[PDB]
Symmetry: D2
Subunit: 182 residues, 4 copies
């Protein structure tokens, strides 16, 4: 039985098993474009719900990365077809943090959005009825929000780690406060 659920991105070069360096099967893995946790996505809700309620997994890691093709896709103002609808959720995130990103040199702006995106997805995860219910009934469950940079493997527990609904709130706010120092 695995002890981690890894929500990652579909164009991320690095396998999870390299990055966590957990032995094989400690890991349960979902990968979507831009590593989203969308409120109403059955595919991923299901994964979380099974992980949490049935596998009794105790740690969930959302992992994003620099140079992420899906974050690029999202920012591009272009008619890509069905996927554009998937990437609206990232565009909302962008809009939400517009003053912040607006202040950045254009080039460093996608990297900011990868980091921001992770914090927001972690928050969504903590706000699912599965994770809410677990914390409410006293189950041990941690949420983690990592961005890794291809430029020498490096991984940072982006401000977000949460073990409760209270601490989910503190962590995300601090995370955004801290992305906002330039």
């Amino acid at each position: 039985t695995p002890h981690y659920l890894w929500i990652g991105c579909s164009d991320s070069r690095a396998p999870a098993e390299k990055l966590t360096n957990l032995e094989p099967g400690e890991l349960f893995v979902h990968r979507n474009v831009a590593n989203q946790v969308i409120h109403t996505d059955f595919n991923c809700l299901s994964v979380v719900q099974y992980a949490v309620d049935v596998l009794k997994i105790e740690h969930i890691i959302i992992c994003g990365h620099t140079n992420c093709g899906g974050i690029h896709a999202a920012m591009a103002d272009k008619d890509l077809g069905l996927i554009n609808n998937w990437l609206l959720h990232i565009r909302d995130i962008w809009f939400k943090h517009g003053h912040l990103l607006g202040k950045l040199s254009p080039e460093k702006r996608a990297d900011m959005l990868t980091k921001i995106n992770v914090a927001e997805q972690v928050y969504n995860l903590g706000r699912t009825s599965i994770v809410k219910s677990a914390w409410e009934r006293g189950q041990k469950l941690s949420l983690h929000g990592w961005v890794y940079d291809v430029n020498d493997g490096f991984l940072v527990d982006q401000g977000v780690m949460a073990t409760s609904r209270e601490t989910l709130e503190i962590s995300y706010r601090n995370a955004i406060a801290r992305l906002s120092i330039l």
Copy 2:
């Protein structure tokens, strides 16, 4: 740039990177429970559209595996919650091949069903609007159904391989025929 979409299972202990020994960078990876391509699942369908239409990928591979928690979770007639709805499509397939699976020794059914699942997911995939258009406008897109087993670490291209609607019908039907040939240790 990637030339391959791998649709695989959230259980799979082993990366596509390992399973195909392509350099990581070649693969573009979706993973979900029991490697499904459900007709109306926005998540996977989006992965597929992006890959085919934007990334321009000529090869999609759906890779199931033996000893699969999801398949066993599908067959365990249990009240697991939300996830059961997701695994209902797997039971649809169980039901659809129930005579084959019935004429068969119990401790072998999960693995038969893992193999049958791959056949059907590829059928589903070749019937997405995304893949049909691609094929209709002359794009080069090969779909593959693989199954891997850990005991010996090796794959086998589950008779499923399509480069056309034409060929999808034939390999799908063939896969099911080869699957229906039972070596009598049931």
Copy 3:
């Protein structure tokens, strides 16, 4: 509070409130194309789950109809775009009952499929984890499968009515056995 959930089709001319002739607000209403209950559709699962667990509704009616544009769309072998994916589920139903429909004069074949489609959707509904759980915990809950014909309003409780998992099975099988007499 309503006492019925009505799952209907989006191109069905007749409002539910005409057909059930329930007073207003006895009714809680979802409408999709070809009145599907798809296993993994969040929109509709949500509706059922809220109806059943929160509104404590005691009757769910899936309602289809003759001359249904969505059933026509499904049968047509044509590139309609995103919707084709929605209508694959109806195409599966068609394939499943191919011998039967194969035997019918082409013209009467879409009407058969509307009827068959309803029985299958009712079954899916009875197989959701929401409805399974309700019956398991002793909640009173009936499932109903109606096809109505524009040609003089007429509505028939298509073989399917279910109040338990056992009776869901008997009813659907009898329903199909009975569609199969020509």
Copy 4:
């Protein structure tokens, strides 16, 4: 044939047929909880694509209403199960207009939020790939945001009405500005 898509709420006590007094046959109807158009919801997005691309409908109307069980269910900070995930998008919007809704008398917030919801659903709808392409290729498609109230039985076209990406920006922003004008019985 229909010339109109109505996206409305599963609570609404009243048919679109009544609400618009078009002959039934003109309307093509989707109904879900809190009249949402979620970016990635296959159900509604499919209704929308079919209508726009196949049925060739020049008018989509999203119609919310006062005294809405879904909106109140959204705001009730309660553990309702699966449905809460669906209503999280409504709380996203609550949160996004929290200052407006905070400067406002409690028994009025649900109805403000019903109105704000309609503005946002139409924004979402005009940003679907389906509606953007339509508009880009010169199709005639007007999107409308309405809210009805039973007390007086009448509607009001919630400042939201778009025939272009251009005009969508303007009415959306305008809707929110008119909404932000508070007659002081908060």
